[PDB]
Ligand binder design. Structure first.
Ligand SMILES: Cc1occc1C(=O)Nc1ccncc1
Length: 284
């Protein structure tokens, strides 16, 4: 029975290697990674891979791995797929830990924009969780943490992390991680998956997919939002993506809204993540 080597980049930046049978469905590999990670609350997570166009795709756990990676390497990342709006609701500390690791990468990468003060507060909770109480012996006036906190590090930011870390004496790792999450969950781009698109007039927009619905960013001046409940049908055709809106009270007709995506694969990818979000966040 022939097996393919799989390499998975974990949220701590380390590499997990395993073998699965070459006709394996994605769930087989995901189950192995989650057992490796001692992760029970698996529903929020998934594996990604890069397609022939170097686009991030979710590995569909119900489909054969080989029919998704196709010509590409069996190389994956372990990621948060569904960001919980209230991480305090999660049953296990280790789930919140992996969600913290993902968010730290969302922040350093710039996918999750954050004010100076919130970057320093999030950083200070990470340092408290990982090193425990502030020790002066480690940090002088010239201290720079090994921890990556932000897309652009400044001495002022490092100083503010230390100032806040000092305030956290006695805080346990789970407690610090829960504070991390209570701050991060409020950020306007928390758990928003962004897709480049054009509206029905050709104006460049971003579509954001998240727990609360589909967001349209025309810029910073005028953001439209469609809460999942309103959305009856999500569809794609050629390079186009459509949502069927519920009729408003006393309106005769449903309303269908249309966007242009970069190519047919980008339209299908946006459709699939919307359908998946739509189901996930109506069902608890
Ligand atoms: C935040 C939210 O609002 C409505 C539903 C949910 C939710 O978390 N659903 C879910 C959790 C775990 N597995 C599957 C679905």
């Amino acid at each position: 029975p022939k097996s393919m080597q799989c390499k998975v980049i974990l949220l701590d930046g380390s590499e997990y290697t395993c073998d699965v049978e070459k006709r394996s469905r994605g769930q087989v590999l995901f189950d192995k990674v989650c057992e490796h990670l001692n992760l029970l609350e698996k529903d929020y997570f998934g594996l990604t891979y890069r397609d022939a166009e170097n686009q991030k795709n979710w590995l569909d756990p119900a489909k054969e791995i080989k029919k998704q990676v196709r010509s590409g390497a069996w190389h994956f990342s372990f990621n948060v797929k569904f960001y919980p709006p209230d991480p305090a609701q999660l049953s296990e500390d280790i789930t919140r830990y992996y969600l913290c690791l993902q968010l730290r990468d969302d922040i350093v990468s710039g996918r999750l924009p954050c004010s100076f003060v919130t970057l320093a507060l999030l950083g200070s909770y990470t340092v408290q969780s990982e090193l425990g109480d502030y020790d002066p012996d480690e940090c002088g006036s010239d201290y720079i943490s090994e921890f990556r906190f932000a897309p652009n590090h400044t001495k002022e930011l490092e100083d503010k992390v230390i100032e806040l870390h000092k305030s956290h004496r006695g805080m346990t790792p789970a407690e610090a991680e829960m504070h991390f999450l209570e701050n991060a969950k409020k950020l306007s781009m928390y758990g928003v998956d962004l897709h480049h698109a054009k509206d029905s007039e050709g104006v460049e927009i971003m579509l954001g997919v998240c727990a609360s619905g589909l967001l349209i960013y025309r810029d910073r001046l005028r953001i439209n939002r469609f809460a999942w409940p309103k959305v009856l049908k999500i569809s794609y055709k050629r390079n186009n993506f459509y949502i069927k809106i519920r009729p408003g009270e006393f309106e005769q007709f449903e309303s269908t809204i249309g966007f242009k995506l970069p190519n047919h694969r980008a339209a299908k990818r946006l459709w699939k993540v919307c359908v998946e979000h739509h189901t996930f966040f109506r069902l608890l």
